Amino acid sequence: RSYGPVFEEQPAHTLFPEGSAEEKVTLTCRARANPPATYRWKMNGTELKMGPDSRYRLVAGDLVISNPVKAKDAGSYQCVATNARGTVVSREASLRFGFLQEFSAEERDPVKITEGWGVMFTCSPPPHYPALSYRWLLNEFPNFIPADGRRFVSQTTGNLYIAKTEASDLGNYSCFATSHIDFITKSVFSKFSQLSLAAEDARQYAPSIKAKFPADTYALTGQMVTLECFAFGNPVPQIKWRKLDGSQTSKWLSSEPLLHIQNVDFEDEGTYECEAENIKGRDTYQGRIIIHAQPDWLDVITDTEADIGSDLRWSCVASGKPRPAVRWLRDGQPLASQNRIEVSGGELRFSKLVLEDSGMYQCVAENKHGTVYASAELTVQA
Amino acid sequence: RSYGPVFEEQPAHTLFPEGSAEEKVTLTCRARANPPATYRWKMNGTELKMGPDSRYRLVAGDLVISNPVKAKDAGSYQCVATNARGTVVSREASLRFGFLQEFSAEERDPVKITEGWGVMFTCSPPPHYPALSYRWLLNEFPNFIPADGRRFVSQTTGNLYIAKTEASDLGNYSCFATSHIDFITKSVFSKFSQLSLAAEDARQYAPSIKAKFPADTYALTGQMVTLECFAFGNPVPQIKWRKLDGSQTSKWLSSEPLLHIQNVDFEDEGTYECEAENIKGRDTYQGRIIIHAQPDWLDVITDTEADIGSDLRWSCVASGKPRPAVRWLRDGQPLASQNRIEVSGGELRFSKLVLEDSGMYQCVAENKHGTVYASAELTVQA
Numbered sequence A, B: 001r002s003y004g005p006v007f008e009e010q011p012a013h014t015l016f017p018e019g020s021a022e023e024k025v026t027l028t029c030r031a032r033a034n035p036p037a038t039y040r041w042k043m044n045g046t047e048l049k050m051g052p053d054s055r056y057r058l059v060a061g062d063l064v065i066s067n068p069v070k071a072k073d074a075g076s077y078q079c080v081a082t083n084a085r086g087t088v089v090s091r092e093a094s095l096r097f098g099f100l101q102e103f104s105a106e107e108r109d110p111v112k113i114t115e116g117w118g119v120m121f122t123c124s125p126p127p128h129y130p131a132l133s134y135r136w137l138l139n140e141f142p143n144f145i146p147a148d149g150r151r152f153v154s155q156t157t158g159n160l161y162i163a164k165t166e167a168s169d170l171g172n173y174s175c176f177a178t179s180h181i182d183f184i185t186k187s188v189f190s191k192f193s194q195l196s197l198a199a200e201d202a203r204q205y206a207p208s209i210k211a212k213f214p215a216d217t218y219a220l221t222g223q224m225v226t227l228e229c230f231a232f233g234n235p236v237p238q239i240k241w242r243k244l245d246g247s248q249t250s251k252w253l254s255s256e257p258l259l260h261i262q263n264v265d266f267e268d269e270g271t272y273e274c275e276a277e278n279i280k281g282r283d284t285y286q287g288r289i290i291i292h293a294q295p296d297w298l299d300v301i302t303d304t305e306a307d308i309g310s311d312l313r314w315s316c317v318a319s320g321k322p323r324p325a326v327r328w329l330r331d332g333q334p335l336a337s338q339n340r341i342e343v344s345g346g347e348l349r350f351s352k353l354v355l356e357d358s359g360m361y362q363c364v365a366e367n368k369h370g371t372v373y374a375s376a377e378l379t380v381q382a
Helices: none
Strands: A003-009 A014-016 A024-027 A032-036 A038-043 A058-060 A063-067 A077-081 A084-088 A093-101 A111-116 A119-121 A131-139 A151-153 A161-162 A172-179 A183-191 A193-198 A207-213 A216-222 A225-228 A229-235 A237-244 A258-259 A270-278 A282-300 A304-307 A310-317 A317-321 A325-330 A341-344 A346-352 A359-367 A370-381 B003-009 B014-017 B024-027 B030-034 B037-045 B056-059 B063-066 B075-083 B086-089 B092-099 B113-115 B118-122 B132-137 B150-155 B159-162 B171-181 B184-189 B193-198 B205-211 B216-220 B223-226 B230-234 B238-243 B258-261 B270-278 B283-297 B304-309 B312-315 B317-321 B327-328 B339-344 B347-352 B359-365 B370-381
Touching: A003 A359, A003 A370, A024 A093, A032 A077, A038 A058, A038 A310, A077 A216, A084 A237, A084 A359, A084 A370, A084 B113, A093 B150, A111 A119, A119 A193, A131 A151, A161 B056, A193 B205, A193 B304, A207 A270, A216 A225, A225 A282, A229 A270, A258 B304, A282 A370, A304 A310, A310 A359, B003 B075, B003 B370, B014 B024, B024 B092, B030 B075, B037 B056, B056 B230, B086 B359, B086 B370, B113 B118, B118 B193, B171 B216, B205 B270, B216 B223, B223 B283, B230 B270, B283 B359, B283 B370, B304 B312, B312 B359
Parallel strands: A014 A093, A111 A193, A207 A282, A216 A282, A304 A370, B014 B092, B113 B193, B205 B283, B216 B283, B304 B370
Antiparallel strands: A003 A032, A024 A063, A038 A077, A058 A063, A077 A084, A077 A093, A119 A161, A131 A172, A151 A161, A172 A183, A172 A193, A207 A229, A225 A258, A237 A270, A270 A282, A282 A317, A310 A346, A325 A359, A341 A346, A359 A370, B003 B030, B024 B063, B037 B075, B056 B063, B075 B086, B075 B092, B118 B159, B132 B171, B150 B159, B171 B184, B171 B193, B205 B230, B223 B258, B238 B270, B270 B283, B283 B317, B312 B347, B327 B359, B339 B347, B359 B370
């Protein structure tokens, strides 16, 4: 029998590695239907101008863009499936471009500090997207500086921190930055800056946390979260982490500059504290982790066959934080209250259906973190 | 001038290939000194009973064992260098014996499975040491089964996995095991088990990971790590690996059943995920890699000449994970707090030295993964 389009595959957010031999990018879309559906792609809300003289070409629903470039192709794409019965739109997919420029060719400033004092070297990474991973080189590639408790590289800024400088630190320093996309990895490093040391200060001193984490970190359920904390101090301080709670018993989560929380959930929300300590004293720093969640369906609409003149009750309920807002679509178009149709939140109610109400409908749930779609075909029969 | 023993060559862990024409094994040891030092070897803490009627013989410090056998020679050996000035002990060296027995002579059980289903053949390797490398033979040697994505041999168990059985799999199967020690290689293979197939199931099905890796893998810095993952599925699934991180961008490390990480360091610690996918669905499995490190010296004692009645400050600092514990030795004997000697961790302090305190001293740093030694000669002069 004949039935409206039903998505089996929708476009996914895509990051295209600039430069790669690949001279084109494809956005997937497939909808089963009877008769088979036809497709149309929209970018930033506007339909794509196809044709032989166009950079776009379709391959059974999938959109193919030749010679992709950010200046012209970066944006949000949507797939529209249509057939005799009706039309439904797909989730939107963002197309972004990855890149990593070299550091500047300018020589880097030297640093002179009293042996014993801690010091921070600034990376100043070049333009790039998406975020990079960082390491530092001593004198030459590939002499990377190990994470040995006294030397730490922030993965947020790329800056190198030495808790207590020592004579062995004399040398030149370079920031090494890496971009990893799919299976492709590209690294670039800066010119080297010379570290010299003034007469030593052998006096011990209490720790002072220099590298910290945000006052507020927002993460989504299922995501992984990493917080950083590093201090200067003599002797080299030791770092410990804990989550504040009612319990008055000692509980530690990490004994390293980094605190990792896998597959976070709502229970992980709270205030976390980093403690840096040595025989001279201690320093602490606190910040919060707030847990939100992308929308997800709890209840959705399903194909319904009703008799003409009848009243129908349709609804969609979605979870998420912040609480998502539900809206509706009719054959790919926004559906609002009207003659015999009342749209209030996730509830759609028809008053005395008409043979013409038949078609494809979709309820959309959205919040600051994402959007989800649910579709169904309504068949009003006399 | 006269000075205590100083090691130039210490014994190394040794694996002796049983059977080899070599009818003796040698453990190296050499210490420079004035006058030249004398040597003594200890096994499992007890000194070796030398002599002409003994299986042991010395060759300028090196220990030579005639007709080595596990039942009597397997153990930990230590070299002791001594001269007028004092005594120092060497790092310990383990002597182990390599072997590989044949598989049992018993016939192997046949296997019958529905064509389309995946299947696993159990190797059940015979007694051996150290770990072997594995392959499987089809019908006869040397018809090895290639790693073609559909057929995989676990290097942990030696088991053969076929992701989706097909008519071409009909035949007999044997587990081929290889021991490689130094330049010597020895392989043995099992009798063959017959694979027969029942009427085919042509229906496709989502992947299911059957061969996995440990929930927790501990590796040492500089070491190489290999993780395995293989699934049954129709169509044959494709495997992909990634390390979980804060970054929300797609990053893959391998597109094969094996994931190899060369020269691991602390940054490689984390949770890794194997994904098996085909057009019907996907399966995943996660496990962790934890990075530790053998002790290494940061600061050690050096020959010191102090005046009688003087106070001396000696210390040794070592890196490593878990944090190593430092202990001391005086002329090869455990040194603990006493009259004028206070031993606290890696620090040794004498209160008003005496002409008799002169001698050889050693600080030892140890953790679950290894031990390191540092020595120096103390010369108390009036």
